[PDB]
Design a protein around this ligand. Structure first.
Ligand SMILES: NC(=O)c1ccc[n+]([C@@H]2O[C@H](COP(=O)([O-])OP(=O)(O)OC[C@H]3O[C@@H](n4cnc5c(N)ncnc54)[C@H](OP(=O)(O)O)[C@@H]3O)[C@@H](O)[C@H]2O)c1
Ligand SMILES: NC(=O)c1ccc[n+]([C@@H]2O[C@H](COP(=O)([O-])OP(=O)(O)OC[C@H]3O[C@@H](n4cnc5c(N)ncnc54)[C@H](OP(=O)(O)O)[C@@H]3O)[C@@H](O)[C@H]2O)c1
Lengths: 342, 342
């Protein structure tokens, strides 16, 4: 199997570690932490080899004193990896790329908080798997960009996109985060319109240049982001065609407000009750009743579980970069089956 | 002075009562409540005559047992009114119109939760003042509709609107409301797109029929709603033209994120520190840095203080309905001067 190192066992990192372990063709050779906390302990209890992410002997001693077994530092494992999945905080992925991955000549994936310009290309399994094939340094794009890429793939499959206008209503803090607000405000993020979210999608889909217009705010919720879409298309599609295209596209599911899905709280409750690990819904979720077509324009609202949506993308990205699977859909299906998702 | 009865001394009602009092040409002859609470007490302390909103002797005694002075019931005061501002809950305004205002042959204003078909016309001071002139039963439209009316007037002043695409991010509960959620969700409201918000603007501006497309959600905030606008126009407008039109239009002001206005929390902090009564910001608030024009399409974000935005509209509507001033802009200026707003 492919030997995968997870550098940064955090919200993304810990999920990719488990998602890699679920595959039959890759394995986790180590995960890293900087703090000797309950999450570091959980990594060890799960059976992962734990390394200190920063090459600092004093920090290693901190873990040993806290009674958490460590195998060494990032430098003790980096040479054994076929690829590194970087899960480090925003800006730190690029630091690791320049300070560690590149000097050790090892392939690495950065997450969506890093820049398009920091890497060789930008990954979504439906659009740029082939472009990322055999590449060395790739960015798996953000939760929002990932969600937009999927719904835009669905729409593109049945009509040509002329202009996609999207408003993103983003969560303030992940559930674990007890420090970040706002408690009670709506925050323009950014204040400028159109925002950088549109160009981010274009980094994956160059043909959408000048056709994506976004605006975003942050609100006091932790569970999921919501996106609202109004998309002018060239073509005569019906609501049924759009619904069918969404159902056909891997990693998009629909819910019905008629069935009791009144909000993002209900989508997460479904994730919990379904028995999903960490409640993760890696699929983009579209409200069925929101889907409409009026005069060559498609409307819908959708929700993104930001902690988990990019996890299967990381798995497919590994297969692309390591040349493990030639066929993007074959990788998607393999990943999906291993993770128990659609 | 015009003799104004406030039937329903609630969030809107208590504010319209004070705004009427600030005018030199109208007076509040009474306000009504159903429950003997601290708000009933406050009305009395402020010098208003309090009547019981429901003509029920058992209810009058409830007020007497609470030691809150009441002057009688709605039936003891209704025949003295030149006009009734209804401030009752959604659906109750229409009940009051059919059961009280019409049988007593008295003009009445209903609030935005009531229906366009419930009344003779739909009021905003910029657009429909003349059309509502001398009418007997008028709806002052909702917080959201009033805000959209104002920004669309500013834009219409300099270019013809082709399509206005709006996403409304609505507050869950007014500050006083400690019973309504969601605590932690984003809730499509409605799930259908385009939503009823667009046609509500059309009830005011018939020429906007089929040109306004809206979607709305509710989030865990109390302070203000936010709106995002992307508006296709006919005509060559600049950013500076829009900014100027916004500045020129009464009851729209701008704030700069560069000045520390990071969110709706900062806007409210400003209303508080300014010394506004109840911190009310009756003006629509547009973020300056949000205003953009790209290929004949105007972008901006704005915030609406839902509790107070319709208050000065009620005052102007009284003037139109009682034929007190033929010039909409003269009523607007007068209303604004008396309230201390722009
Ligand atoms: N959160 C989301 O909704 C989401 C969704 C998609 C993409 N992303 C992106 O994923 C990346 C990581 O985000 P996250 O939410 O997973 O952050 P996170 O939860 O804070 O986790 C970051 C992890 O990196 C570790 N770390 C700190 N310094 C490091 C270093 N110098 N080298 C290697 N590891 C280091 C931290 O270890 P300690 O905890 O021990 O300090 C922690 O385990 C960002 O680019 C972000 O934009 C996030
Ligand atoms: N809240 C906003 O931000 C907002 C903004 C713009 C427009 N509006 C619209 O304004 C209207 C009222 O909303 P609100 O927020 O002011 O409601 P509210 O704060 O709940 O107040 C309603 C008032 O009506 C009184 N009332 C109850 N039953 C009555 C009856 N049968 N007859 C006369 N009065 C009665 C209540 O008295 P008691 O308290 O004693 O029961 C209360 O004082 C709605 O159409 C709403 O859509 C609301």
């Amino acid at each position: 199997p492919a030997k995968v190192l997870i550098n940064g066992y955090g919200s993304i990192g810990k999920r990719v570690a488990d998602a890699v372990s679920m595959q039959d063709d890759m394995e986790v050779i180590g995960v890293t932490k900087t703090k000797p906390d309950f999450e570091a302990r959980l990594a060890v209890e799960k059976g992962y080899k734990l390394f200190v992410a920063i090459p600092d002997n004093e920090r290693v001693k901190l873990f040993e004193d806290a009674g958490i077994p460590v195998e060494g530092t990032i430098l003790d494992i980096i040479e054994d990896a076929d690829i590194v999945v970087d899960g480090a905080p925003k800006k730190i992925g690029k630091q690791n790329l320049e300070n560690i991955y590149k000097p050790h000549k090892v392939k690495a994936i950065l997450q969506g908080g890093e820049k398009a310009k920091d890497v060789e290309d930008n990954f979504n399994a439906l659009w740029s798997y082939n472009r990322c094939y055999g590449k060395d340094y790739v960015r798996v794009v953000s939760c929002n960009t990932t969600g937009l890429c999927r719904i835009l793939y669905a729409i593109n499959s049945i009509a040509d996109i002329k202009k996609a206008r999207i408003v993103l209503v983003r969560r303030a803090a992940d559930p674990n985060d007890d420090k970040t607000g706002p408690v009670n405000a709506i925050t323009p993020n950014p204040v400028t319109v159109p925002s950088h979210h549109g160009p981010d999608v274009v980094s994956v889909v160059p043909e959408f240049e000048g056709k994506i217009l976004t605006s975003a705010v942050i609100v006091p919720t932790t569970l999921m982001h919501m996106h609202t879409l109004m998309v002018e298309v060239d073509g005569d599609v019906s609501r049924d065609d759009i619904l069918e295209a969404i159902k056909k596209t891997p990693r998009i599911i629909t819910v019905r407000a008629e069935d009791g899905f009144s909000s993002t709280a209900k989508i997460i409750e479904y994730g919990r009750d379904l028995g999903r690990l960490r409640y993760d819904i890696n699929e983009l979720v579209v409200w069925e009743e929101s889907i409409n077509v009026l005069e060559n324009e498609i409307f819908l609202m959708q929700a993104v579980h930001q902690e988990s949506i990019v996890i299967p993308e990381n798995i497919d990205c590994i297969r692309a970069m390591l040349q493990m699977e030639e066929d993007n859909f074959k990788s998607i299906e393999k990943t999906n089956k291993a993770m128990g998702i659609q």
